């Protein structure tokens, strides 16, 4: 059982994208003639602050294209306004591509357990730091054996206390700047404990440290925001 989604994708984003383990996300662009663009999450990696600068240099040297340029511009408009623009569509099956309704970078992947739980749900977590210049959006992908949403939010508050006090510092220092939320929890599905393989990736004659997830069942989740 699979729900098909066929896509007309331009050639300005096909770098690092011919592999199956890719996630296209329909973000609302600032320009109104496409009204949206199907960005990759690896382009959310280069904007992020939690990732390494070496992988950022790799993402710069692999995405010298006007499409990724303008997409970076339209995501760089709204300060922390990404959750009011970003909207996912599911994983790529095969690249003009097909999508269902799995590879991941090593740095943005994280866990808070010893990954010995058999069933493990996967989640996306944005965080909005405000002790930078304006906003450091940290992307995170989390596999965990927890299932109930609210206790995941409580352990996220237990792990992101720096982001919470940075949020309330931004609230008490800049009164005219009204921030919405620290971030967003949203699930994507679940895997077993065995398919997580820390391995390598070579694409466009370029090197990458990857973590692959084989038996990834996909289930779309809502952008459930959290402070």
């Amino acid at each position: 059982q699979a729900l098909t989604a066929r896509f007309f994708v331009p050639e300005g984003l096909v770098e690092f994208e011919a592999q199956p383990g890719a996630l296209l996300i329909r973000m609302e662009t600032g320009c109104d003639s496409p009204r949206h663009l199907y960005i990759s999450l690896y382009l959310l990696g280069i904007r992020a602050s939690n990732v390494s600068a070496s992988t950022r240099c790799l993402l710069e040297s692999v995405y010298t294209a006007s499409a990724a340029r303008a997409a970076l511009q339209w995501l760089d408009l709204g300060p922390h306004l990404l959750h009011r623009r970003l909207e996912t569509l599911g994983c790529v099956k095969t690249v003009l591509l097909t999508c269902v309704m799995l590879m991941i970078p090593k740095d943005m992947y994280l866990t808070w357990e010893e990954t010995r739980g058999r069933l493990q749900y996967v989640y996306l977590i944005i965080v909005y730091d405000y002790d930078g210049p304006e906003t450091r959006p940290g992307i995170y992908v989390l596999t965990s054996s927890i299932a109930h949403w609210q206790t995941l939010v409580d352990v996220a508050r237990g792990k992101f206390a720096r982001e919470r006090c940075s949020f309330v510092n931004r609230r008490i220092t800049r009164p005219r700047q009204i921030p919405l939320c620290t971030g967003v929890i949203q699930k994507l599905g679940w895997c077993l404990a065995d398919d997580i393989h820390t391995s390598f990736l070579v694409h466009k004659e370029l090197k990458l440290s990857v973590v692959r997830l084989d038996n990834f069942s996909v289930e779309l989740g809502d952008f459930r925001e959290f402070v």
Binding site: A5, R35, H36, E87, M101, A161, V168, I172, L220, D222
Partner: protein
């Protein structure tokens, strides 16, 4: 899992022809029977003069929705949707859709329009269908009508009239609407009245209870977050009481039956807002038909 819905009234074959154009669209029914009279179909049983919009949203939140499938000589074959399975829904909503949108269902705002539902009605029954609006437009139009409800009390001045004149006009991708004002005949409808008064009084009891309760928890182990909470409330007090008379004498002693009533009142008045706070998503689209007349959408809920 199919429903039959018959009509007691005489229908013409031309009435079928103007009925069959709504071939795959959502209807609400209050509860699931196998055979149901058509007087329960649609929101016509609920819509009247003195209830308002928020009643329609609240009773739509628990009204079970059903796609239409087929039209027969007297009866209608309805098909209840299931979770995760794809279906075909026609965009009878006033806003165009795009691929990957998240759809919610909200009651219509053009009650008795110029279209009159393309003249599908009956003797003391007009069939009314709920709008299927994308989720961000749904939440912002809820916020827009709520802040229309706040300024509906103070309509004496003219700059508030220009502000609400901005509030009627909405903007969207090739979409513009004049949102109807919930105040009519210089009075608000009762649902918007109780929703906005409850919201404002939740803000009031929060602003006058948060200090004593952050103190009550801050007698325990402390962190930076409660410190900055107290500092934020000090910013509010130092920007708030600049003209109020000094020595208001708030006491640290207060009898328990006051504050338990305060907490329970705050909780019930926020509890009656979650029909309009949460926007329970019901659909997302996997493919849009050309001219956006229909869409293959996957059911949520």
């Amino acid at each position: 899992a199919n429903i039959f819905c018959t009509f007691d009234h005489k229908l013409s074959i031309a009435d079928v022809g103007k009925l069959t154009k709504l071939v795959a669209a959502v209807v609400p029914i209050p509860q699931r029977l196998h055979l149901i009279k058509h007087y329960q179909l649609g929101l016509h049983q609920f819509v009247d003069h003195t209830r308002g919009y928020v009643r329609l949203r609240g009773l739509l939140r628990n009204m079970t929705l059903t796609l239409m499938r087929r039209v027969e000589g007297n009866q209608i074959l309805l098909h209840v949707p299931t979770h995760g399975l794809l279906y075909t829904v026609l965009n009878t909503g006033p806003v165009t859709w795009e691929k990957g949108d998240a759809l919610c269902v909200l009651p219509p705002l053009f009650h008795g329009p110029l279209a009159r539902e393309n003249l599908l009605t009956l003797g003391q029954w007009e069939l009314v269908l709920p709008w299927i609006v994308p989720m961000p437009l749904a939440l912002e139009i809820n916020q827009r009508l709520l802040i229309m409800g706040l300024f509906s009390l103070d309509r004496s001045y003219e700059e508030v009239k220009a502000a609400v004149q901005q509030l009627q006009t909405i903007t969207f991708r090739d979409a513009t609407f004049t949102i109807p004002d919930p105040v009519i005949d210089q009075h608000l409808l009762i649902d918007m009245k109780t929703a906005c008064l409850s919201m404002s009084m939740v803000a009031n009891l929060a602003s006058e209870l948060t200090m004593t309760y952050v103190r009550k928890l801050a007698l325990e182990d402390s962190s930076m977050l409660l410190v900055k909470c107290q500092e934020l409330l000090m910013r509010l007090d130092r920007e708030r009481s600049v003209g109020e008379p000094r020595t208001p004498a708030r006491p640290q002693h207060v009898s328990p039956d006051d504050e338990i009533a305060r907490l329970s009142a705050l909780f019930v008045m926020l509890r009656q807002l979650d029909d309009l706070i949460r926007e329970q998503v019901v659909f997302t689209v996997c493919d849009v038909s050309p001219d956006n007349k229909s869409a293959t959408c996957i059911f949520k809920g």
